[PDB]
Each structure stands twice: as C-alpha cells, then as structure tokens.
Amino acid sequence: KAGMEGLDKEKINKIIMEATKGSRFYGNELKKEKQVNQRIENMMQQKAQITSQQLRKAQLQVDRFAMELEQSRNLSNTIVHIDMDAFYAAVEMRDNPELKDKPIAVGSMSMLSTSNYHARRFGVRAAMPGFIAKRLCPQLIIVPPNFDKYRAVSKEVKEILADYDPNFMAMSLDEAYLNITKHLEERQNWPEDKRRYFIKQNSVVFGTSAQEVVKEIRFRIEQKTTLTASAGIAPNTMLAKVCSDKNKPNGQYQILPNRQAVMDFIKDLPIRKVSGIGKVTEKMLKALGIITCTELYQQRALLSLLFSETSWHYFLHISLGLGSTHLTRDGERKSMSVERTFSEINKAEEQYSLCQELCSELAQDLQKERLKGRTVTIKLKNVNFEVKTRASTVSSVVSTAEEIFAIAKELLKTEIDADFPHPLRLRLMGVRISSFPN
DNA sequence: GGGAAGGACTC
DNA sequence: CTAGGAGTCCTTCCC
Ligand SMILES: [Mg+2]
Ligand SMILES: [Mg+2]
C-alpha cells in the first residue's frame, strides 16, 4: 500500500467485499487460497520430518555461505532508485489541468492501472477494478491509459538521469536505478555555479553529498516535466528500492554506506516490503513465524531444507541486506504477447476469429522490432478464471499473421475438441510468441 | 538440456 | 468490457 495509510480499513473493506462476495471471480480466488493452504501443508509436513542433526548440519553450510557473502559485502557504490509519484495519473493531471483538483485513476471501469493520491485517500489503488473503486469514491474520474503520452514523459526524465549515470538502467516507464558513485567523486570538485539552478532570490545551489545530488535530480525532474519523483539512496539496488517508498510521494530516504546502517534498517523491515517477495511467499513464511528480515535470517537453517536452493540463496541475501551493486544494463526480449479479456464468448466461430485478430495484431507489434520467433503459445481463460496454456514450437521461425495464426488456429482447435460437445466459455484469450534466434 | 504447463511476482 | 495486460523467471516433468 505505497502512498496513503491511516485509512478507514472497515468501511473500505466492507464495500470491497460486498462488491465481490458471490462473484465468479471471488469464487476462483477462494479456490486459489485453498490451493495455497495445501502448499503450506506439504511444507509443514516436510518440516515435521527433520532431525536436529539434519538441521544442525544445515546450520554449518548456511553459516559458512553467509560468512562468504558477508566477506564480499560491497559498500562502495551509491545506488539511487528513482520512482515517479502516481505516474500515469500525474501525467494525465499535467496534460489536463482540470483533473489536477480531483480524485482520478488511469484504467477502465473494469481495472485501474494507478490512481492519484487524492483518490488513494478513499482507498483507491492500482490492480483494483474501476467499478469497486467508484463505489469507494463516487466522484472518481477514470481516465483511459495513453502509453504514448507516458513514454514521452518517461524519456523526458531519462534525459536528466543520463547526466548522473550514462549507464543507468530503466525498469519501467517510471523507475530506474542509477549508480551515482562516479558522479559523486567528480562532484566534490564542482564549484557552486555548476550546482546552481534557477527556480520555476530565485535560484538554489545543491551540495556535494549523495543526499543533495538526489535532491538536485528530483528538483530538475519536477521543474522540467511538472511531475514529482521519490528516491532511495543506499549501498545496493535491493535496499535502494525499499527506500524509494519510505518517503513517497515527493521525498527520499538514505541508508548510509556502512554495515550497521544497513543492518539497522533491515532489522524490523517486513519481508513483504522487499521486491520479489509476493503475497504467496509472505503467507508461506508467515506460516513458519517469519514477518521481519531479522526473523528471516534467524531461520536460515530451516529455509535451506524447505525451499529450492535458489529461494533460500535469495532469502539469505535479503536477510543480510545484500543486493546488486552493479547495474547489468542487459536487455534483449524473451517473448512478445497480446491478450484480451472480453464479455463472454462461447461460439467457436468467433473464438477462431478472435484468435486471428490477436495473432494478426501480435505480428504487427512483433514486426516493429523486426523480430522473428519459433514458439507460439495460446492462453485461454474460462468464465471461472481458470487458465489453460498450450504451447507449440516448430523449427523454422514464423513472423506474420497468417503463419503464426496457422499454429494458434490448431492449438485452439485441440482444446475445443478436448471439451466437445461442450463449447469453451471464454472471458480471455491471448497469444505469445517466444524463443527468438539470439 | 530442449520442450510444455502452471505460477509468483511486479508495473 | 462488470478483476488488465505485459513480461520474466522458476519449478517439474519428460526424451
Ligand atoms: Mg512510481
Ligand atoms: Mg514485495
């Protein structure tokens, strides 16, 4: 909940529930929770069959591993995570001044991509459907998303970022990591005028410290675009991101570059505030008595024998406050996809032609990157939100509508057939091309 | 070690 | 169109 707290979680939760109670969605949502409780159940079973000598041995490895990490802990880099405030809303408020005074969201009546802060006061958030949102805030204006407009402001701000780190990596249209470690060195020798900017006396000079260079960035960002950003400063990416939210909107937070600072932050940081730990992992760990990053580190024993090698390796990093100190600046796309949810469709005649408009639309997007690919996956979703997913890869490549529809046509047919005589009651369909030459 | 199927997570 | 769409990475399962 990254914005408004101190909310009437009673009148809000009641409304959300009344508008979800007997829904077809909530039904599936309930079966999911059952499925997640089962998963916990097998974990809790696996736990019950561990012997203290088994556990004790785990302690040896994990502590040795820890010790290795701890020795290669890097506190030399200053990483900044920039995170625009209520981004899609804000852009729209900028574009259309009228809206600047009221609660608004960007999305549809059936789903919100975000919502400006005034609306968050009513508990209106992203991922929440616009019709529930409107019940929370009957005067909410929902604005349709216009990605071209958002991409502009994105590259409008990416222009400020390159100054402080030509190598900065963007994560989305409103987020990027910067490693200002090198800028911070050169900046120590910068005279006033090189760090003095004219407002909207009318001028300010920014200091020489990381804290200031980030104030300066945020300032330039607000002045050039009209929008406000928040920022996190810390030794590595994982912390920098947690920090960029500690003071939203329009503020910033630093963890100073020393072990203890890190350690003091982490201590009581709820594990869910970390990027990559979701709703499920939270619940699974809460089940083992794990809520804060301290509790996560103290169970490093158990974790290495209940979870995939990659999950505990990862969990351990977080528990010790480690993260990336080096922005990969990688890239290259793994897949491209087009999918669409719609008022029910059970007629195979249209199911086939929807798959065509999709395959066809995909081809064009795929075309603009001049990309070609071997694998093709369709994705159908019942009227009950159950999702199927059927793949097929050929051995040539395939690129245009007709050829990509060629394969998707068939995959669709097999599932219509598989359920015959009963037709497939669909709310969603989608088509994903992947495995590109490389 | 190249598939296919289902999911967790995040924006 | 009255619970999105887009993408990546993982976990498991078979030649
Ligand atoms: Mg943001
Ligand atoms: Mg999280």
Author numbering: 25 to 224, 281 to 518
Sentences from the paper on this structure:
The crystal structure of Polκ in ternary complex with a template-primer DNA and an incoming nucleotide, reveals encirclement of the DNA by this unique N-terminal extension, referred to as the N-clasp.
We crystallized the Polκ catalytic core (aa 19-526) in ternary complex with a 13-nt/18-nt primer/template presenting the 8-oxoG lesion as the templating base and with dATP as the incoming nucleotide. The cocrystals diffract to 3.2 Å resolution with synchrotron radiation (Brookhaven National Laboratory) and there are two ternary complexes (A and B) in the crystallographic asymmetric unit. The structure reveals an 8-oxoG(syn):A(anti) Hoogsteen base pair in the Polκ active site. In addition, the syn conformation of 8-oxoG is stabilized by Met135 emanating from the fingers domain. A Mg2+ ion occupies a position corresponding to “metal B” in replicative polymerases, and is coordinated in the basal octahedral plane by the unesterified oxygens of dATP β- and γ-phosphates and the carboxylates of Asp107 and Asp198, and at the apical positions by the α-phosphate and the main chain carbonyl of Met108.
